């Protein structure tokens, strides 16, 4: 399951401190700054999406047998005519919405599968563009708040 081995008391401590620091706007590492910037972009993206449209989660029908084809179909069209940071945010929000819908409809097995599909698409097809465009630090420059 997502977060298989983060069960120690040490991680409970780390998790609480991380929540408090990012809640007040502070990042303890470059990675932390990217994660915070990405979570907030997702929150902002989905709010704008829900106002123009229905719930991002008012979704197409997910099943275990068709989830990958839906994912592949949506993602390939999202980046067919190019990549930018806004579409990468949209890609994260889409995966997040698939996961929420999957759990809500009692298909929790899909969460880790979707996670693999996202990491695979990110590492094979977005990572080259990310490097040619200033890396994730440039994303933080453009979408971080502090």
């Amino acid at each position: 399951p997502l977060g298989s081995m983060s069960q120690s008391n040490r991680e409970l401590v780390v998790d609480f401190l991380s929540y408090k620091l990012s809640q007040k706007g502070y990042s303890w590492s470059q990675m932390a700054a990217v994660k915070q910037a990405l979570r907030e972009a997702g929150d902002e993206f989905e709010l704008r999406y829900r106002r123009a449209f229905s719930d991002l989660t008012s979704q197409l029908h997910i099943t275990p047998g068709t989830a990958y084809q839906s994912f592949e179909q949506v993602v390939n069209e999202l980046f067919r005519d190019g990549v930018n940071w806004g579409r990468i945010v949209a890609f994260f929000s889409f995966g997040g919405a698939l996961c929420v819908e999957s759990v809500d409809k009692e298909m929790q097995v899909l969460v880790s599968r979707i996670a693999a599909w996202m990491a695979t698409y990110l590492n094979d097809h977005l990572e080259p563009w990310i490097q040619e465009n200033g890396g994730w630090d440039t994303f933080v420059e453009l979408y971080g708040n502090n």
Binding site: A52, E77, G86, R87, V89
Partner: peptide, 20 residues
């Protein structure tokens, strides 16, 4: 169905990109 969704994702993605 999925042609519609990805169009909404793309146009929302691009508007967000322009504003940042």
């Amino acid at each position: 169905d999925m042609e519609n969704l990805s169009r909404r994702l793309k146009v929302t993605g691009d508007l967000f990109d322009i504003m940042s």
